[PDB]
Amino acid sequence: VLKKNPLKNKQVLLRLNPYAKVFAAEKLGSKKAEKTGTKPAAVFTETLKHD
Amino acid sequence: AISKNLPILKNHFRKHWQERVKVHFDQAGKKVSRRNARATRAAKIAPRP
Amino acid sequence: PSRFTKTRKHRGHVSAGKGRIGKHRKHPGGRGMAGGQHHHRINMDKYHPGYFGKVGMRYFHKQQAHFWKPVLNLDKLWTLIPEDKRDQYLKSASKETAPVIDTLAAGYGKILGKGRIPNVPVIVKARFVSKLAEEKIRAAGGVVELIA
Amino acid sequence: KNHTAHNQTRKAHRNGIKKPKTYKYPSLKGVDPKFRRNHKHALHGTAKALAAAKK
Amino acid sequence: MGKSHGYRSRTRYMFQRDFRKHGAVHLSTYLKVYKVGDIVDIKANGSIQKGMPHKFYQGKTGVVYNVTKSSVGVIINKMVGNRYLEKRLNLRVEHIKHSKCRQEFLERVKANAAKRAEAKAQGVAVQLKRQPAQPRESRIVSTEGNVPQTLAPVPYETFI
Amino acid sequence: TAEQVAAERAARKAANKEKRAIILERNAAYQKEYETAERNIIQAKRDAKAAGSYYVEAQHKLVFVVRIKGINKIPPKPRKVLQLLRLTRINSGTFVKVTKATLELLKLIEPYVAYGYPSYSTIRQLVYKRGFGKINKQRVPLSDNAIIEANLGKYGILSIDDLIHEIITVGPHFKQANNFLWPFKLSNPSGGWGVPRKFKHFIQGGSFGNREEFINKLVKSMN
Amino acid sequence: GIDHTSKQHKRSGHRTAPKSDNVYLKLLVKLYTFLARRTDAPFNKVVLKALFLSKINRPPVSVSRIARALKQEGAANKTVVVVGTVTDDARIFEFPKTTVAALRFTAGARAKIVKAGGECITLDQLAVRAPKGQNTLILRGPRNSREAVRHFGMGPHKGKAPRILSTGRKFERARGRRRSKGFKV
RNA sequence: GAAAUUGUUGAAAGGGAAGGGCAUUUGAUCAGAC
RNA sequence: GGAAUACUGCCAGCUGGGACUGAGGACUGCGACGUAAGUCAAGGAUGCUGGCAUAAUGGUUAUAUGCCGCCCGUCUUGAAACACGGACCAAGGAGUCUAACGUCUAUGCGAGUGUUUGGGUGUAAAACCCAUACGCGUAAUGAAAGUGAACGUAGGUUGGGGCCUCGCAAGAGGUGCACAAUCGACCGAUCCUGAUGUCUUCGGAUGGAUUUGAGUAAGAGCAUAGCUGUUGGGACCCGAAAG
RNA sequence: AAAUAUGUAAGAAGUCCUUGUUACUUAAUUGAACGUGGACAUUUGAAUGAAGAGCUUUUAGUGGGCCAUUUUUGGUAAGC
Numbered sequence A: 001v002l003k004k005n006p007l008k009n010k011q012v013l014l015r016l017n018p019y020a021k022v023f024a025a026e027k028l029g030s031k032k033a034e035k036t037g038t039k040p041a042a043v044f045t046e047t048l049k050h051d
Numbered sequence B: 001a002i003s004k005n006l007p008i009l010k011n012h013f014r015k016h017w018q019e020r021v022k023v024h025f026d027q028a029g030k031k032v033s034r035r036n037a038r039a040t041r042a043a044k045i046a047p048r049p
Numbered sequence C: 001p002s003r004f005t006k007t008r009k010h011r012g013h014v015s016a017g018k019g020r021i022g023k024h025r026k027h028p029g030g031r032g033m034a035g036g037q038h039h040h041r042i043n044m045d046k047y048h049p050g051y052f053g054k055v056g057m058r059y060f061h062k063q064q065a066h067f068w069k070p071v072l073n074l075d076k077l078w079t080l081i082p083e084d085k086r087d088q089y090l091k092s093a094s095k096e097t098a099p100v101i102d103t104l105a106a107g108y109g110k111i112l113g114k115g116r117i118p119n120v121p122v123i124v125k126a127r128f129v130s131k132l133a134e135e136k137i138r139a140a141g142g143v144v145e146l147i148a
Numbered sequence D: 001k002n003h004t005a006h007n008q009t010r011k012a013h014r015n016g017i018k019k020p021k022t023y024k025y026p027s028l029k030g031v032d033p034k035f036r037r038n039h040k041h042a043l044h045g046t047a048k049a050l051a052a053a054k055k
Numbered sequence E: 001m002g003k004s005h006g007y008r009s010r011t012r013y014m015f016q017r018d019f020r021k022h023g024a025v026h027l028s029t030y031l032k033v034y035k036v037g038d039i040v041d042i043k044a045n046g047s048i049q050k051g052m053p054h055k056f057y058q059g060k061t062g063v064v065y066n067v068t069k070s071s072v073g074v075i076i077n078k079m080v081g082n083r084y085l086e087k088r089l090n091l092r093v094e095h096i097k098h099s100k101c102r103q104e105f106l107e108r109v110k111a112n113a114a115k116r117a118e119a120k121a122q123g124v125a126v127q128l129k130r131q132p133a134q135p136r137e138s139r140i141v142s143t144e145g146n147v148p149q150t151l152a153p154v155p156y157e158t159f160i
Numbered sequence F: 001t002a003e004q005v006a007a008e009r010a011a012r013k014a015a016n017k018e019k020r021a022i023i024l025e026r027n028a029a030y031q032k033e034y035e036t037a038e039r040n041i042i043q044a045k046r047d048a049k050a051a052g053s054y055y056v057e058a059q060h061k062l063v064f065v066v067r068i069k070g071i072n073k074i075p076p077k078p079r080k081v082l083q084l085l086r087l088t089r090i091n092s093g094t095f096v097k098v099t100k101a102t103l104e105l106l107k108l109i110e111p112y113v114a115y116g117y118p119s120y121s122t123i124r125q126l127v128y129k130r131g132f133g134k135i136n137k138q139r140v141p142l143s144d145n146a147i148i149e150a151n152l153g154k155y156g157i158l159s160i161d162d163l164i165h166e167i168i169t170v171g172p173h174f175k176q177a178n179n180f181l182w183p184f185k186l187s188n189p190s191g192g193w194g195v196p197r198k199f200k201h202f203i204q205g206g207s208f209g210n211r212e213e214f215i216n217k218l219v220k221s222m223n
Numbered sequence G: 001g002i003d004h005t006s007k008q009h010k011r012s013g014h015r016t017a018p019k020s021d022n023v024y025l026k027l028l029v030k031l032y033t034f035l036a037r038r039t040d041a042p043f044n045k046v047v048l049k050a051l052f053l054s055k056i057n058r059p060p061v062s063v064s065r066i067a068r069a070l071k072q073e074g075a076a077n078k079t080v081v082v083v084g085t086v087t088d089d090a091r092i093f094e095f096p097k098t099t100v101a102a103l104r105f106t107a108g109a110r111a112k113i114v115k116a117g118g119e120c121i122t123l124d125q126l127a128v129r130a131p132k133g134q135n136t137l138i139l140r141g142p143r144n145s146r147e148a149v150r151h152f153g154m155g156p157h158k159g160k161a162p163r164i165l166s167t168g169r170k171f172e173r174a175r176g177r178r179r180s181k182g183f184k185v
Numbered sequence H: 001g002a003a004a005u006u007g008u009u010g011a012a013a014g015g016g017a018a019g020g021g022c023a024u025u026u027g028a029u030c031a032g033a034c
Numbered sequence I: 001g002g003a004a005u006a007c008u009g010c011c012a013g014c015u016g017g018g019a020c021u022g023a024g025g026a027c028u029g030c031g032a033c034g035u036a037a038g039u040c041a042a043g044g045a046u047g048c049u050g051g052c053a054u055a056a057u058g059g060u061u062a063u064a065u066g067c068c069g070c071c072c073g074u075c076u077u078g079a080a081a082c083a084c085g086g087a088c089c090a091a092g093g094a095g096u097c098u099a100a101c102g103u104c105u106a107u108g109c110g111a112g113u114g115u116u117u118g119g120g121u122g123u124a125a126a127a128c129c130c131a132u133a134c135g136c137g138u139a140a141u142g143a144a145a146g147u148g149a150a151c152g153u154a155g156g157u158u159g160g161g162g163c164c165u166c167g168c169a170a171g172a173g174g175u176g177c178a179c180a181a182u183c184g185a186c187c188g189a190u191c192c193u194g195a196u197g198u199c200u201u202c203g204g205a206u207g208g209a210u211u212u213g214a215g216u217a218a219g220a221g222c223a224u225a226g227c228u229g230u231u232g233g234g235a236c237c238c239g240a241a242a243g
Numbered sequence J: 001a002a003a004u005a006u007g008u009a010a011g012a013a014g015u016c017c018u019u020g021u022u023a024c025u026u027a028a029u030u031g032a033a034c035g036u037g038g039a040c041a042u043u044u045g046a047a048u049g050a051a052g053a054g055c056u057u058u059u060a061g062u063g064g065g066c067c068a069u070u071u072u073u074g075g076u077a078a079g080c
C-alpha cells in the first residue's frame, strides 16, 4: 500500500539485501588500501614539466 | 443532389398531392354498415337467400 | 419517439449540428437529380454505371401473363408429395406403383436439373423440362410426361 | 490561394502510410498464358499422382 | 503558354549516355539470366526506345514476376497519397541489372550454413548474428623514441 | 480442513532461507569482483607510469541519458528518436548501451538531452529509490526480490543486486533487463542546474550534450 | 505533459455483454461467465463470446451442414454445438443419430433429428453433460452470404452489384457498361 | 396578484463609473450537535 | 628527504533543528533481534493531557483591504473596436410529419414469410378468429428468339479457432467450421472448330477460348419496431426586385 | 563532384539433399514452375522500440486561411 525507501529504513534494506549486514559489520566502505611504492619515470616528469 | 451511394428513387410527389389524400378512418364503421345492410336485406327478402 | 432524437441533445448549441461556416441552405446543388451529367458526374459514374442511353428494342403492349414459368429444381421435387405418404413411397415403390407428381397443379412451368434425387421411379407431369433434368429422371428410373 | 502542399504530409501520416499485404500463391493472371495452361495441367497431374501413391 | 506533362518531360540529363559511352551495348547485358523472384534495379538506356520505363522508376528496385521473349515484368511499390500501390512494369532487359546486395546476402547464407555445420562437426555452438562496431579496449602507448612534441597556436602573419 | 499451518509454513520458510543463502553468496562475489577491477586499473596506470608509457583506459560501454527539453516544437526526426529511446517527458531517464548505432542516435537528439557515463553509486541509488518494473503492461514497484525472480529469473537474475550487476557490467541480457525496468521519472535538480541558461552545449556553458562525468552530480541532485 | 504515442481513453472494439433483454439469455451468460472464469477449458470462452453476438453474426445452420460435418474422420460420435438456430433442409434424404445442442430449433429440424434417432438439448444441459467441452464440435453458418455483402465495396472494375430498386433492360445497362455506349467500366 | 419601474422606513458604501475572482478582518444573522 | 593540508570522489558512518501528510481497517506477506516462546521502526498513527460546550469553530450576508479582471452574441486569417444586433421586463418563438429507401440494432417465425382489401364475431372504431389470392424470397443470363447450374467424400494447395490421441507438460500427430489467398469444375452470353442425320435446310452433336455475367458449388429470407443518413413535399424559422 | 533528402535487402513464405507432375521448353534422361520424403530452434541470422495486431461497414464538418526561420521567381522596390 505504501512505497518504503531503502537507503533509509534499515528494515527494508535488510529485507532486500542480506549482504548489507556484513558490509556494515566489517565496515567495507572505509577500506584501507595497502601501500605501494612505484616511482614515476624521468621521461614522464620531464615532459610534464617542460617538454 | 446526388451523393453517398444509394438507389435511385422515383417518388412522384411534385403536384398538389396534399389536396387528394384519402385516409381510411371509417374501416370499422363501413364494416358495421355493410353488416347492417346485409341483415336488413335478408329480413326484407326472407326466406330467399 | 421524439425524446430519443438528437434534436433534443442539440438544444443550446447554436447551429444544431449543421456547421458555422457552411450555414445550412435550401438546395445546395439543385433539386432531385439535377446536374447528373455536369457537376454530379463522378458520383453517377462511380456508383451508377449504365444510367444514360438506350439499349435493346421496344415491346408495345407487353403482357406478363405470357411469360409465366416458375422453375423447380430436381432436388426440391420430393417436397411435392405430402409427408405422410413420402416415406412409404421412399421405401415401398417399384416401377409398378410409382407416384405421379403434377407440377402444374403445384404452380410450376419448367423443371430444371440442379441436385440429386434418390433411386425411386416417379412420373412427372410438366409443361417444359430441360435436357439434364429429363436425363436424371430417366436415370433414376422414371419418365417425364408432357402436358399442355 | 492557387496551390499549396502545406499540411498534406501531416494528413498522410495521421493514419500512417501502409504497405500492402503480400500472400503466398500470387495471382497468375498477367503471367504468360502458355506457362499458365501448362501449370494447370502439371498441378492436376501432381494432384492425381499424390492421390494415387499417397494414401 | 501552358504547362506540359508529356511522357518524357524533364528528362534532359536522365536519359543521356555517359562520357565516351555511346554507341551499342555489350553482350553480357543480353547474356544474363533472370528468374521469377530475382531483385533488379532500374536504370534506363536512352539508346533503346522500346521497352523504356517512366522517369519515376529510374533508380528503383523491384521483384521479377514474369519472364517473356525479350522482356521481364517487375513489381514496384509506389506512394500514392496515404498508401502504397503495387505497379507492374514490363521492361526490356537492356534497362535492368541484378542487385548486388542479394548476391552478398546469398553468399552470407551459404557461409552461415557452412559455419554452423563445421561448428556442429567440431562440437561447439558459434554465434552467427552480425554485431555493430564496439568501443575500444585498453592498451599501452610506449614512448621508445616517440617522445611527445609540444604544439602551440600560430600567430597571424609573422611567419608567413 | 487440512493441517495447513505448519507443513507448508515450514516448507515456505525453508525455501526462503535457501534463496537468501544463494543471494548472500552471489552478493559477496560481486563485491569482490568490483573491488578487484578498480584496484587492478589503478595499479595498471601506476605501472605504465613507472615503465615510462601511458595507459589508455578502455572506452565506456554504458551511458545514462536524461531528457531536458519539454514536448512542444520538436522536429519529426528527433521526436521519433526520443520516442524510440522512451524519453516521452521532461526529466525522464534511461540507460543506453554504447555502439555505433546508438552513437548516431545520440548525435541526432543532442540538443534535447544530457547524457554521461554513470557510476556504480548512482546506478545503485537510482535502482533502489526509483526502480519500477514492467509486469503485464503495468508499472510495479520492485520492493522485493520475488518480483525480480518471477519475471527476470529466466535469465538467471533473481535479486535487485543481480539486476544492478547486469546493468553496470553490460552482460548478455542487458536488453531484457533494461527493457524490464520502467523509464526513470526524476524531479528537478535540488540545487539548480548551475548555469543561467541551459539550452546551450555543456562546453559553451549550458546543459546539453555529453558532460561524461558530471552526470553523477546532476542525477544525484535530481534523484 | 507527455509526448503521447496513441489515443488515450480508447475502448476495445468488442461487445462485452448481449444487447438483448432476453432474461434466459442473461441466465446462460451468467452460467458461462462462471464456467469460463473457474475452468481452464478454451471451449467455455468461445461459447461465452459467441453468446454476445448479433443476428447477422450468428447465421442459421442447416441439418445438411451438420450431417456433412459428422461425415468427418472420427467425428461421427461427437456432440454438435451451434450458438444459434438450427434450420431444416429437404435436399438431404438420410440423417444420422447424433446429439445437437443449440439455442433454437425450427420445428422441422427438431422433428427430423428426433425421427432420425437423436436428441435436441439446450446449452445448460450441455454444460451439465460436459463442463469442459469434452467431445464437442462447434459449427458456424455462412457469414458472407447475406444480400447486403453483394454491394459492399462498390467501384469501377470491382465486380459488385449496384444498389438498385428495379431490374430490366432499361435499368443501368447502357453508357458505362458497354463499349458501344461510350465505355465499359 | 410575478417582473420591469416607483414611494416610505431601517442598514451600509461613495476624492472622475458600477459590477467580478482568490483570500481574510469587521458588523449582522443562522443550522447541526454534544 | 619526510610529512601535512587543499581539490575531487565514496561509506549498506553517526547525529541535531523545521515544515506538510496519516490513505487503509480481523488474520494471511517479506523480514529483523533472540538458543526459543516472544518482541519489533517489518504489506499506510497511535499514546497521554487540557480548555470549551456555545454563536466559540463554521456557514450565509453587507462591506473593507491586497493582487488580478475591457461588452456580450455573430461573420472573419484577424473583435474591446470608430464592423453588425442589443433601453428594460413578461409571455410566445425555429430540424416537424409523410411516401419510398441505405447501413446498423432488437424481436417473431424460418425455405419460407406477411391475420387487419374482405369475411366471422364482439362486453363494439378495441380484443379474438379465418378462406382464396397476392407481394417479397427460394435461378441466372441475353437486345431478343431462347437456354438454364455435382467428373469428384460438392475438388486440390496454403493458413485457421475449437475438439481428439500421446507425452508429467511446452511439444508431436489427427480432424479441421467461419473467414482470407490461389488453381480447377458447372450454368448463360460472345467467338473459334464445325460431324453422324435431315421435307437437304433444317437440325448443332462435339471440342476449345490472355473473352464476358449484378451466377452455381448442403439455401437466408420475410415481417414489425428504433437511432442515424437520403430524395420529393412549405420541409429548421423569417426576407426580394418579379410573373 | 559534396552535405541534406531518396529506393532495396538484412531468412521458416528460409537453406540443403533426394526424386514426382506437365499439353511449356531442350538434341537429350535438359530446364522451368509446383511438390512428396529427409536434415537444420540455448542466436531463427544487425540496433532500438512496440501504448495489442489485422479487417469491415457507415456517416459528420471542411473545401476563404494566415505567420515565422531558411531556399527562391517577377516587379527600383513595399505590410507588392
Ligand SMILES: [Mg+2]
Binding pocket: C017, C018, J060
Ligand atoms: Mg450533422
Ligand SMILES: [Mg+2]
Binding pocket: C037, C038, C039
Ligand atoms: Mg459537363
Ligand SMILES: [Mg+2]
Binding pocket: none
Ligand atoms: Mg427470362
Ligand SMILES: [Mg+2]
Binding pocket: D001, D002
Ligand atoms: Mg482555394
Ligand SMILES: [Mg+2]
Binding pocket: D007
Ligand atoms: Mg498545423
Ligand SMILES: [Mg+2]
Binding pocket: none
Ligand atoms: Mg514505335
Ligand SMILES: [Mg+2]
Binding pocket: F195, F196, F197
Ligand atoms: Mg535561470
Ligand SMILES: [Mg+2]
Binding pocket: none
Ligand atoms: Mg419590484
Ligand SMILES: [Mg+2]
Binding pocket: I024
Ligand atoms: Mg485511517
Ligand SMILES: [Mg+2]
Binding pocket: none
Ligand atoms: Mg459568524
Ligand SMILES: [Mg+2]
Binding pocket: none
Ligand atoms: Mg470567523
Ligand SMILES: [Mg+2]
Binding pocket: none
Ligand atoms: Mg463574516
Ligand SMILES: [Mg+2]
Binding pocket: I068, I069
Ligand atoms: Mg488589470
Ligand SMILES: [Mg+2]
Binding pocket: I079
Ligand atoms: Mg466580439
Ligand SMILES: [Mg+2]
Binding pocket: none
Ligand atoms: Mg455597435
Ligand SMILES: [Mg+2]
Binding pocket: none
Ligand atoms: Mg442600435
